[PDB]
């Protein structure tokens, strides 16, 4: 059984968005709406905004699971590379198991799930409404291995699947996007967007 | 606490003590001389740390695993480096040592293990960091695969231990650990850390 990535706004019109992401080469992360692709630097903070039209039921959670994008890789569990797993850096005194790729930053209620049947690793946080007079709920994420990590992602592309779930695991909403953990998000976005507009004959400027 | 005297136990203790004659004799009685103790240490780790160069040369030339990693990831090259022994480092490198092999806790290569306050530092560290910097550029970009490699992507080259290939591009800016190489007629990316300047001794 392969995790489903199909977008599902659902009954609460579940949206996953990103604040104005710097197009600068200095940027630690950037999101491409054109490609539905997130570019991030290893172990850096990536704020993701969640929006709902109506509050979901009590005990609702938000899961984030990484999955390999290509069909020939999809049965392989997205895990951390052996080297970063055994390393001391970012592993000393952490709540997160050393093998998990996705971490939640600054939430004591986060849960690091290792499914005993599928072997799939993910991280779950309870749903929390926005602050008084705010539009979005912010979740801070960290991606702990580069896409290029030999033994881990090993240059294979991935999807990040965000799903709004009931306490029993029933799906209320889902949004997915491609993830890229690299040294230069800003440069890699620009290059990819330029190649896409050319290949797809998209009118620009 | 029973002291073990089986052939592997003898080869290891002999390599540590510097009993070359005993080492030359007990090695043919051991099923696998590259096999480690409970802490991941092999006869070569012992030969190197205790500074018995004659046993180091013997074991390596015999065909013992030159890249054996103890429980903490230390290979004989990490051990030779921690001793600032440029002569053993040079010999191990020439015998297929993995220059980019890292210790587990810290992600340190052999070159990082050199001791600043000990004698022979400058010469040993500069030699090892030199190999790390010149590999795939020097010797007309000729390197060797020290492990098999099964590609995960279309633009990657399959490798077999001992395979000799030429490095076309290192791309030290974008994906430092991946190099564009040429093996036979084909070209692809290979992981730098599986490669050596010279091949292993069979």
Residue numbers in the entry:
A (entry chain A): 114 to 318
B (entry chain B): 920 to 1121
Reproduce text from the manuscript describing this model.
All three proteins share a similar domain organization containing an N-terminal transactivation domain, a DNA-binding domain (DBD) and a C-terminal oligomerization domain (OD).9 p63 and p73 contain an additional sterile α-motif domain and an inhibitory domain at the C-terminus. Both p63 and p73 share approximately 60% sequence identity with p53 in the DBD, and DNA contact residues are strictly conserved across all three proteins. To address the potential for similar p73 assembly, we solved the high‐resolution crystal structure of the DBD of p73 as well as its complex with the ankyrin repeat and SH3 domains of ASPP2.
The six p73 chains in the asymmetric unit were traceable between residues 114 and 311. Overall, the p73–ASPP2 structure is highly conserved with the p53 complex but exhibits a shift in the ASPP2 position to better accommodate the variant p73 L2 loop. Both side chains undergo rearrangements to fill the large SH3 pocket formed between the RT and n-Src loops.
